[PDB]
């Protein structure tokens, strides 16, 4: 019966379309849409599981580099998981499965489909892997052995069989993630497998497979620190690669809508950003609205006391370096550099596998310095640290993992500012030298803006407030960041006063002793005939008081729903004591007082408070290391 | 007959493919390609209509937040459009339909498919919405009620039915735009609907649906200013969300090729950029080539006199803030901050719904200041303003909407420079304090560049021109920006002169009185034994004269087709009077004259004209507020 | 027989699906997946061929602008390649086919499918183009004649037939690349074809076609320099467009995973980046790991002596300008600006077709200056040049093309830093004026970082090293960049010394004569009562010595696999002679010595070495022009 024939396997081949081709050929050529749709559906599901403390069953492919090949170092463990070669003490799938749940709360289950020396053709034809593993996401890395001619693999065969593997795992219900092959000389020798896998990356993008640039992971690392032989990593290299893959997942890198961090990006807890993926690893971050938050979003990132809380911010850094700024408060253990989440210590050179500037002349060896106490100058913007290297970065903000935190830690905002790598510092004065920029905090009294057609009356410059430049802020854990007991913690600045008459005064604004936040100005350069005509400059470090712009209950009850606050109610001097000072959320101001000897001259004053700040720093950050 | 059976509904199920599955199952799994292709075809059509003064029929989905739910504030209007709950006086679909035609000229027709408390399953099964509305684009927002368990909605049911809605509206010929759900505490409480709709965003990207991050819209706003209750917006919040959606459309955000503004992006009228989408709302922008344009592209953005002209620049800002620089001239009414296109004034706290820095200590309450008169220092780069917050931004450059503009306004270029939020200012001296950077305008006479092997002869430093740093430029509407009548409008700078002999002179370059653009230098620090040996420093603010690089008609007639101009013909002093001065298109130069007392010493001079400029400012911008 | 009928052309139409539509209609609507998959598969293949010295058969479409229409200038050649109109002496397909193999080694074969005045409908119905050309990639540009109503072309007909052309060329095995139409007034007149082709771009993105923004190419150029008539280019405009298309290809712009350069991006040879595509044009770049590399990646980009080596870095610049920094060494001929790879010189105004800032007041006419000798201050970061304009940029690092290079040239890293256009310089002091930023190199002895709770002992400030700011570095070819023989090559800086006691000293740090790299400080401003109490400041320019962090062979042999090096072994003075000095890879340090007259006061010293640097410069770059 033709019916049975139509219902048979070859039924689609007996029906031809208007172009002369059979229906079966049309279906076979156009099935990439089904694979693409299934792939991104499963990828969206996997992203949801990553960001919602879910569970991921992960199948890990392909060859020796996925298998954790290590036959050179003494940090090896016997061959497991269907491999034949001695494995490093920690490969990338296992570091991924130990890292992703730790940072995001998403449980990871490993299905190791990795054999050393295997090709894409070998993986597609491997007897043990012919069954559906029923996992959620599959990471595929096959280029190194393919380009070496292993098992007669050619570029066409490699590409065909990697496409076949992608389609097979998509049909198996697995989200296919394609990895640019990792390992070996940071691109030394112009390896063919990079080109092969680039072609395969584009063919994978045909199916909507996200590409994890694993070659990018080791670009800014020390080769000796991450490699066991000329091609394969040691334990630390594999661990860093797995951590970077997990960072890609918690960044939202599985999604097509993901955008890398290219400019200054400020995110907080509970808000969804396509640039920085935030993961609450244990679900105990209190993302409630409180007026006590130091940001206008009022979204307190409460890392509550007594609860082991882990706050994770993952993103792709599209620059050679970035500066992490945060409105943090409390004892927050911060890890953001690879090689400090995991280091077994088996090899002494693992610690030198951190992301470092490749330019020998632009940076010394990177001694990573992270802050754990961000409780000083409470309410102020804190310098969390720096991220070196282009790629996927994770900022781990966690409290005591045993739940022994006595006070609430707050992550009110995390700012990732891509910075040029030579203009970045590990901490404030935490490296040999900081290439800073002379930043001018300028104020005009009276300002010419908005006047128009009319000359404002000249004013006497007797007192003014200026936001303290970054050099004026100290670095230290907790209250040690305040220069109150150690007035050397702040860099003396310059206050340059200009007027329309050509009268110029330059003061050296340095802190006056170790009792309170008081600054005293020394006259450096002035245009006056006598130095006795120069006013005495005294300043104090203070924060702006809180005024209520719109009080809740003004147009109904209910009906500016919340309180719109500003810190423009006046400047109050701070003594550096958090128990008696106001919150520094209103800003760190240097409130200058000019004690003129005679009557205060009236004029159109331009005040420039000079300091050195990091490149592009929006707000002066207090250092906490 | 098997034929009738094949032609029947179940005909595809009776034919099986080579894998054992029926042809019908193959078609059902692989139909995502058709939906994706139709979706982006309609999205491209919708983008064309947005950017070509077209017409869009917009169907608005889904729940209470799309419906404009407001049952708390007194700014409510009775339930319309098939909803049951009291609506805010302006929801986001209606603000979108009032904003998109106003800014782009694209007529918007509303089909309100929004009911308060509705889920994706309820929308797919809603009796009134089972018919094809025959609209062009559909915006879908369903996560809040789904995650609350409304009508038994689960995550799987939610995802299934949102995918069903997307496919249904794609088949109906509607461009499907997916919105990250908006509303409530800026991410407070770690809402489940954010995660659900993130998963749904990825599944929508399966179908090529652009994702409008509506959660991102309220991240940098005051919660009390935009919310009516804990989850739903008031009139201003909905208005800002609709304006942001329209900004996404006029940015080109409907297209996969759209790229966010990540670095300094300069665009003008009539040119197509994948970063900044420009919309001519009324078709009356004269985008002709004239040598009178202040830019080398010669594309004059003539907002012609007597014509109501609206120039719109929309884009996604991938930074926490940006600075708008423009080569504008004339009376251009500028609106670029949300909350100033629309504000009914019913609630006094609506004005505090502007994009503000969440850091209390990095910014006071944002008092938005926009310039309407950019006619001063004509030809110079103008500081248009700042954009705060990551997301979609619109820059509206419109003249008198009644056609009563007497002179032609010119938009020769608009530069959007992503800047760190703390380094941004609303206007020049328009906020409490500007965190500026000390910018050094350095010139070497003779320069060592390009010499090689040979020592150039030492030259006498008697006169030189330097581009005026930003601090040297004033702010004011029209001619009020020129410090000619009010010499306090400019900040005095420093001219530091170095030579190879170790001779150093530091002048205070301040403006000499209120008659003309003349600057006079006061000697601050010098290395000479006697201050009488220091030359007298006099400067004037002037522009470079026009020289013809290649005159049209030189190699044929026809045949450098146009005139290649440069402004390097010499420096001419300007008096600040636009009726007698040259155009400032040649740059704002401080032309210094050194009157040495004895013969002018010869040497290898390094001249550093110090000033304070905004972070990353390419060209010194004149302020116009 | 129904069987024959099913196997007939209309067989699919006789089988209907469950929705009532026939199987044929389902196949016709959902075939976009097959076209998309084939398109990106061929695009990945084409990208592989571009980056692996492959071969591309390129079919060039569409109208007069693809055909190289030029009927106005005297730089025309008779009509070739099936066109009817006089062609410019170099159109964009031929410049592309001469440029892509030159820069990437990928052989290009031209199939000219371009006729002047042709539309998309005309191209689809052209008799000569009905056959499959069996080429690899097709570039399509059809909007100008379509919007003019040529051959009755309407927007719907245009869109339909361009989609038909895209599908036809995808079925023909050709990678379809869609070009935003180029030509005419930089967007003058608000041309309709820009909008039409924007719609067509989105419909092309339906099929995964990469969009080459050719309208973006001429945005920052002089119109007179690139145009022959009001719409069509001259030879130079077409050449620049073809070079930009080739730059798009070597950037990896054919791939969906490509990301533009938005922030500082550092890449080297042999590494794969999704931001900067690196092409080894002749396969002779030695990308081996050597400790002699100036970067921590140790990937030497050896342009070996005696071999014609071409190193190409292509990328999309998502800013108005960028600065090219490189750790280069040797005689590397650098071309990075369009109009300098190709210029036939037939028209004198072709040289003014370079990417220039459109703001007349922010830049003079761009006199491009590129460095060929980067052998000075060996090991230091070099300022390669600047890239102006948003779009696709190529950095060509090639040695003597005849193989007469005597020494090995090294490309250890190329850094592309997007910079604001007004803050960019062509070379160090290579333009009229550099708008620099006052950068403060700050060091604290003792630093307050990491101490906590305890006051460190005060130290005497007798000697310290500081990384030299950019103003301290000279510019010149090879050893001419060293200020050793011509001490005017460096800009004198300021060393500001602060302490906790309010003692401030400001020195003028200028070079002490022309014998060696010795700097001497002149006291400018001090807070001391007597200038005799100020210490004598002497400095030398030196590099840090090499210390071994982890020596290879420490934990096994094999087993920190390589040597982890740092340059923190001490500071050694350099004389500027490359034959006797150390490599400058350890950094360019100004090592200051303070000779106090009495005993050296002890205190908490803040040292600020002030200089002027370019905006966002990570490491001080030596200029090489």
PDB file of C-alpha atoms in Angstrom, chain C residues 386-528:
ATOM      1  CA  UNK C 386      45.419  56.811  16.617  1.00  0.00           C
ATOM      2  CA  UNK C 387      42.343  55.533  14.806  1.00  0.00           C
ATOM      3  CA  UNK C 388      39.647  58.081  14.060  1.00  0.00           C
ATOM      4  CA  UNK C 389      36.051  57.249  13.283  1.00  0.00           C
ATOM      5  CA  UNK C 390      33.585  54.553  14.242  1.00  0.00           C
ATOM      6  CA  UNK C 391      33.750  51.473  12.079  1.00  0.00           C
ATOM      7  CA  UNK C 392      36.085  48.683  11.054  1.00  0.00           C
ATOM      8  CA  UNK C 393      39.782  49.396  11.485  1.00  0.00           C
ATOM      9  CA  UNK C 394      42.872  47.483  10.408  1.00  0.00           C
ATOM     10  CA  UNK C 395      46.308  47.796  11.999  1.00  0.00           C
ATOM     11  CA  UNK C 396      48.920  46.553   9.529  1.00  0.00           C
ATOM     12  CA  UNK C 397      52.253  45.686  11.149  1.00  0.00           C
ATOM     13  CA  UNK C 398      54.537  44.609   8.319  1.00  0.00           C
ATOM     14  CA  UNK C 399      58.289  44.489   7.818  1.00  0.00           C
ATOM     15  CA  UNK C 400      60.219  44.950   4.570  1.00  0.00           C
ATOM     16  CA  UNK C 401      58.069  43.198   1.974  1.00  0.00           C
ATOM     17  CA  UNK C 402      61.173  42.215  -0.022  1.00  0.00           C
ATOM     18  CA  UNK C 403      62.588  40.255   2.915  1.00  0.00           C
ATOM     19  CA  UNK C 404      65.485  42.666   3.503  1.00  0.00           C
ATOM     20  CA  UNK C 405      64.789  43.115   7.226  1.00  0.00           C
ATOM     21  CA  UNK C 406      68.070  42.687   9.091  1.00  0.00           C
ATOM     22  CA  UNK C 407      66.703  42.274  12.630  1.00  0.00           C
ATOM     23  CA  UNK C 408      63.694  40.519  14.120  1.00  0.00           C
ATOM     24  CA  UNK C 409      60.684  42.732  14.756  1.00  0.00           C
ATOM     25  CA  UNK C 410      58.449  41.844  17.692  1.00  0.00           C
ATOM     26  CA  UNK C 411      54.723  42.431  18.121  1.00  0.00           C
ATOM     27  CA  UNK C 412      54.309  41.348  21.734  1.00  0.00           C
ATOM     28  CA  UNK C 413      50.923  43.030  22.214  1.00  0.00           C
ATOM     29  CA  UNK C 414      48.688  45.535  20.443  1.00  0.00           C
ATOM     30  CA  UNK C 415      46.379  47.602  22.639  1.00  0.00           C
ATOM     31  CA  UNK C 416      43.401  49.360  21.070  1.00  0.00           C
ATOM     32  CA  UNK C 417      42.051  51.883  23.557  1.00  0.00           C
ATOM     33  CA  UNK C 418      38.894  53.726  22.447  1.00  0.00           C
ATOM     34  CA  UNK C 419      39.529  57.363  23.307  1.00  0.00           C
ATOM     35  CA  UNK C 420      37.409  60.500  22.859  1.00  0.00           C
ATOM     36  CA  UNK C 421      38.254  61.983  19.495  1.00  0.00           C
ATOM     37  CA  UNK C 422      39.395  65.339  20.871  1.00  0.00           C
ATOM     38  CA  UNK C 423      41.597  63.604  23.441  1.00  0.00           C
ATOM     39  CA  UNK C 424      43.395  61.608  20.740  1.00  0.00           C
ATOM     40  CA  UNK C 425      46.676  62.595  19.113  1.00  0.00           C
ATOM     41  CA  UNK C 426      48.130  61.401  15.833  1.00  0.00           C
ATOM     42  CA  UNK C 427      51.547  60.990  17.457  1.00  0.00           C
ATOM     43  CA  UNK C 428      53.151  62.329  20.618  1.00  0.00           C
ATOM     44  CA  UNK C 429      53.234  66.055  19.807  1.00  0.00           C
ATOM     45  CA  UNK C 430      52.438  65.039  16.229  1.00  0.00           C
ATOM     46  CA  UNK C 431      49.508  67.428  15.911  1.00  0.00           C
ATOM     47  CA  UNK C 432      48.987  71.121  16.667  1.00  0.00           C
ATOM     48  CA  UNK C 433      47.934  70.582  20.290  1.00  0.00           C
ATOM     49  CA  UNK C 434      47.289  67.617  22.576  1.00  0.00           C
ATOM     50  CA  UNK C 435      44.369  67.853  24.991  1.00  0.00           C
ATOM     51  CA  UNK C 436      46.063  65.877  27.760  1.00  0.00           C
ATOM     52  CA  UNK C 437      45.029  65.009  31.297  1.00  0.00           C
ATOM     53  CA  UNK C 438      47.090  65.818  34.372  1.00  0.00           C
ATOM     54  CA  UNK C 439      47.964  62.335  35.617  1.00  0.00           C
ATOM     55  CA  UNK C 440      49.272  61.922  39.153  1.00  0.00           C
ATOM     56  CA  UNK C 441      51.640  59.026  39.850  1.00  0.00           C
ATOM     57  CA  UNK C 442      51.148  58.699  43.597  1.00  0.00           C
ATOM     58  CA  UNK C 443      53.175  56.644  46.067  1.00  0.00           C
ATOM     59  CA  UNK C 444      52.807  56.485  49.848  1.00  0.00           C
ATOM     60  CA  UNK C 445      55.753  55.656  52.074  1.00  0.00           C
ATOM     61  CA  UNK C 446      54.649  54.141  54.349  1.00  0.00           C
ATOM     62  CA  UNK C 447      51.423  53.171  52.662  1.00  0.00           C
ATOM     63  CA  UNK C 448      48.351  52.987  54.927  1.00  0.00           C
ATOM     64  CA  UNK C 449      46.957  50.028  52.981  1.00  0.00           C
ATOM     65  CA  UNK C 450      46.884  46.700  54.759  1.00  0.00           C
ATOM     66  CA  UNK C 451      48.156  47.967  58.107  1.00  0.00           C
ATOM     67  CA  UNK C 452      44.967  48.185  60.172  1.00  0.00           C
ATOM     68  CA  UNK C 453      44.712  49.203  63.814  1.00  0.00           C
ATOM     69  CA  UNK C 454      48.444  49.994  63.976  1.00  0.00           C
ATOM     70  CA  UNK C 455      50.472  53.045  63.016  1.00  0.00           C
ATOM     71  CA  UNK C 456      53.528  52.181  60.895  1.00  0.00           C
ATOM     72  CA  UNK C 457      56.819  53.763  61.843  1.00  0.00           C
ATOM     73  CA  UNK C 458      57.572  56.998  60.022  1.00  0.00           C
ATOM     74  CA  UNK C 459      60.143  56.636  57.257  1.00  0.00           C
ATOM     75  CA  UNK C 460      62.690  59.052  55.835  1.00  0.00           C
ATOM     76  CA  UNK C 461      62.055  60.059  52.223  1.00  0.00           C
ATOM     77  CA  UNK C 462      65.568  59.763  50.815  1.00  0.00           C
ATOM     78  CA  UNK C 463      64.889  57.795  47.634  1.00  0.00           C
ATOM     79  CA  UNK C 464      62.001  56.320  45.673  1.00  0.00           C
ATOM     80  CA  UNK C 465      61.088  55.116  42.195  1.00  0.00           C
ATOM     81  CA  UNK C 466      58.066  56.280  40.215  1.00  0.00           C
ATOM     82  CA  UNK C 467      56.806  55.094  36.855  1.00  0.00           C
ATOM     83  CA  UNK C 468      57.446  57.972  34.491  1.00  0.00           C
ATOM     84  CA  UNK C 469      54.235  59.693  33.334  1.00  0.00           C
ATOM     85  CA  UNK C 470      53.655  59.984  29.614  1.00  0.00           C
ATOM     86  CA  UNK C 471      54.872  63.587  29.362  1.00  0.00           C
ATOM     87  CA  UNK C 472      58.273  62.385  30.623  1.00  0.00           C
ATOM     88  CA  UNK C 473      58.664  60.108  27.583  1.00  0.00           C
ATOM     89  CA  UNK C 474      60.017  61.296  24.268  1.00  0.00           C
ATOM     90  CA  UNK C 475      58.950  60.639  20.699  1.00  0.00           C
ATOM     91  CA  UNK C 476      61.215  59.640  17.840  1.00  0.00           C
ATOM     92  CA  UNK C 477      62.152  56.833  15.471  1.00  0.00           C
ATOM     93  CA  UNK C 478      64.248  54.234  17.240  1.00  0.00           C
ATOM     94  CA  UNK C 479      66.797  55.693  19.649  1.00  0.00           C
ATOM     95  CA  UNK C 480      65.568  59.191  18.756  1.00  0.00           C
ATOM     96  CA  UNK C 481      62.666  58.566  21.145  1.00  0.00           C
ATOM     97  CA  UNK C 482      65.191  58.438  23.993  1.00  0.00           C
ATOM     98  CA  UNK C 483      65.875  62.004  25.201  1.00  0.00           C
ATOM     99  CA  UNK C 484      69.505  61.022  25.809  1.00  0.00           C
ATOM    100  CA  UNK C 485      71.110  63.145  23.037  1.00  0.00           C
ATOM    101  CA  UNK C 486      68.252  65.666  22.807  1.00  0.00           C
ATOM    102  CA  UNK C 487      66.950  66.317  26.312  1.00  0.00           C
ATOM    103  CA  UNK C 488      64.169  68.513  24.905  1.00  0.00           C
ATOM    104  CA  UNK C 489      62.343  65.339  23.813  1.00  0.00           C
ATOM    105  CA  UNK C 490      60.833  65.018  27.306  1.00  0.00           C
ATOM    106  CA  UNK C 491      58.328  67.368  28.929  1.00  0.00           C
ATOM    107  CA  UNK C 492      59.415  68.507  32.411  1.00  0.00           C
ATOM    108  CA  UNK C 493      57.059  67.321  35.123  1.00  0.00           C
ATOM    109  CA  UNK C 494      56.299  68.110  38.738  1.00  0.00           C
ATOM    110  CA  UNK C 495      57.195  66.029  41.778  1.00  0.00           C
ATOM    111  CA  UNK C 496      54.905  66.982  44.657  1.00  0.00           C
ATOM    112  CA  UNK C 497      55.950  65.586  48.038  1.00  0.00           C
ATOM    113  CA  UNK C 498      53.421  65.595  50.879  1.00  0.00           C
ATOM    114  CA  UNK C 499      53.689  64.437  54.471  1.00  0.00           C
ATOM    115  CA  UNK C 500      51.370  64.152  57.457  1.00  0.00           C
ATOM    116  CA  UNK C 501      52.936  67.250  59.061  1.00  0.00           C
ATOM    117  CA  UNK C 502      51.717  69.529  56.280  1.00  0.00           C
ATOM    118  CA  UNK C 503      55.183  69.801  54.735  1.00  0.00           C
ATOM    119  CA  UNK C 504      54.850  70.171  50.967  1.00  0.00           C
ATOM    120  CA  UNK C 505      57.564  70.381  48.310  1.00  0.00           C
ATOM    121  CA  UNK C 506      57.005  70.910  44.586  1.00  0.00           C
ATOM    122  CA  UNK C 507      59.942  70.243  42.273  1.00  0.00           C
ATOM    123  CA  UNK C 508      60.199  70.875  38.553  1.00  0.00           C
ATOM    124  CA  UNK C 509      61.548  67.543  37.318  1.00  0.00           C
ATOM    125  CA  UNK C 510      63.383  68.286  34.066  1.00  0.00           C
ATOM    126  CA  UNK C 511      66.140  66.341  32.364  1.00  0.00           C
ATOM    127  CA  UNK C 512      69.682  67.272  33.400  1.00  0.00           C
ATOM    128  CA  UNK C 513      71.530  67.810  30.152  1.00  0.00           C
ATOM    129  CA  UNK C 514      72.092  65.563  27.166  1.00  0.00           C
ATOM    130  CA  UNK C 515      74.383  62.967  28.795  1.00  0.00           C
ATOM    131  CA  UNK C 516      72.437  59.941  29.981  1.00  0.00           C
ATOM    132  CA  UNK C 517      68.906  59.642  31.311  1.00  0.00           C
ATOM    133  CA  UNK C 518      69.342  61.924  34.322  1.00  0.00           C
ATOM    134  CA  UNK C 519      66.633  64.237  35.660  1.00  0.00           C
ATOM    135  CA  UNK C 520      67.176  67.153  38.023  1.00  0.00           C
ATOM    136  CA  UNK C 521      64.514  68.813  40.153  1.00  0.00           C
ATOM    137  CA  UNK C 522      64.094  72.558  40.595  1.00  0.00           C
ATOM    138  CA  UNK C 523      62.236  73.632  43.728  1.00  0.00           C
ATOM    139  CA  UNK C 524      59.081  75.474  42.654  1.00  0.00           C
ATOM    140  CA  UNK C 525      56.823  75.625  45.722  1.00  0.00           C
ATOM    141  CA  UNK C 526      57.612  74.486  49.248  1.00  0.00           C
ATOM    142  CA  UNK C 527      56.076  74.938  52.682  1.00  0.00           C
ATOM    143  CA  UNK C 528      59.444  75.229  54.442  1.00  0.00           C
TER     144      UNK C 528
END
